[PDB]
mmCIF file of C-alpha atoms and ligand atoms in Angstrom:
data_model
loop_
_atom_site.group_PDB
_atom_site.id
_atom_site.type_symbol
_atom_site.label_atom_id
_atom_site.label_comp_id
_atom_site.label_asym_id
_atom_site.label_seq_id
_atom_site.Cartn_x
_atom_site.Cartn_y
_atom_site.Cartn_z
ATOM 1 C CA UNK A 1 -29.933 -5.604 -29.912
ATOM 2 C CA UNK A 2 -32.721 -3.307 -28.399
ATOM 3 C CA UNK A 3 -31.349 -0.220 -30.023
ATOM 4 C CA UNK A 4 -34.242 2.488 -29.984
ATOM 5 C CA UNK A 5 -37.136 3.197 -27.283
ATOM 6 C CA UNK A 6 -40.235 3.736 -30.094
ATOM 7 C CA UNK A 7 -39.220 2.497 -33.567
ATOM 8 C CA UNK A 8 -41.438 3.439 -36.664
ATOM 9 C CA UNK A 9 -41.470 1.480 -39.981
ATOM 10 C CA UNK A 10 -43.426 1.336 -43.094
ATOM 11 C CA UNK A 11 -46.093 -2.128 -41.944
ATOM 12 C CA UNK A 12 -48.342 -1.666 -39.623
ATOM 13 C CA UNK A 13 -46.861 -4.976 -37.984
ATOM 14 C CA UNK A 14 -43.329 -4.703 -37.143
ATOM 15 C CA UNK A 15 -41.686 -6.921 -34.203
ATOM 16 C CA UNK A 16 -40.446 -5.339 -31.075
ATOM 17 C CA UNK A 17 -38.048 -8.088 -30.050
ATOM 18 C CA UNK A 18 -35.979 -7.965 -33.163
ATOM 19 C CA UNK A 19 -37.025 -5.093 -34.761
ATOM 20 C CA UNK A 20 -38.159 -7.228 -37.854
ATOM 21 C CA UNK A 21 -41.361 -5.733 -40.146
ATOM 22 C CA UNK A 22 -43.956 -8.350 -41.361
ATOM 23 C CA UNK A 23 -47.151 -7.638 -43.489
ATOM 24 C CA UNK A 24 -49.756 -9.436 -41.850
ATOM 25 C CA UNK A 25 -50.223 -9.941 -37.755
ATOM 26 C CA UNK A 26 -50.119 -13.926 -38.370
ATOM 27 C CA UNK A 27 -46.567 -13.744 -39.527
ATOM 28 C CA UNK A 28 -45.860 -11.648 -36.529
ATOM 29 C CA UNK A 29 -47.193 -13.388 -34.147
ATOM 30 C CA UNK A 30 -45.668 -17.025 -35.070
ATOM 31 C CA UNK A 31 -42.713 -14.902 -35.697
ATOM 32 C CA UNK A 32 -41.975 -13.175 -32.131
ATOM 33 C CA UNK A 33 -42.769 -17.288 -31.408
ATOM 34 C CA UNK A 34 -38.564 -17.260 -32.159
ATOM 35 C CA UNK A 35 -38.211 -15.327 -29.351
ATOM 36 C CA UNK A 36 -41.045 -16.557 -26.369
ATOM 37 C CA UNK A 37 -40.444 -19.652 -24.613
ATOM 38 C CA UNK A 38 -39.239 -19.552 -20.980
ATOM 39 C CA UNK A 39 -39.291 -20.687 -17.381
ATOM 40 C CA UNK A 40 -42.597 -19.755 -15.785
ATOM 41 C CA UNK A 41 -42.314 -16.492 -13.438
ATOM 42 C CA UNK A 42 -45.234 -15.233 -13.419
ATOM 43 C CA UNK A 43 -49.235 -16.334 -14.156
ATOM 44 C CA UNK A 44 -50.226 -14.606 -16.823
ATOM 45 C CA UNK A 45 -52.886 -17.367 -19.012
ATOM 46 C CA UNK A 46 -53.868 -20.563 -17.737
HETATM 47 ZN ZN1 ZN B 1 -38.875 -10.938 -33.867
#
């Protein structure tokens, strides 16, 4: 799981969730999509 308080790969764009690397942000950010997705708690965009 979350094994490691700061990680540091070789991309610029690497996934915090996971721990998965990706090349461009676009792939990241519909990536970490995988892992979002959950009752509402708290108001953050509306
Ligand atoms: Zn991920």
């Amino acid at each position: 799981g979350s094994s490691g308080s700061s990680g540091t790969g070789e991309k610029p764009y690497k996934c915090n969730e996971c721990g998965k690397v990706f090349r461009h942000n676009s792939y990241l950010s519909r990536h970490q999509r995988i892992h979002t997705g959950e009752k509402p708690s708290g108001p953050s965009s509306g």
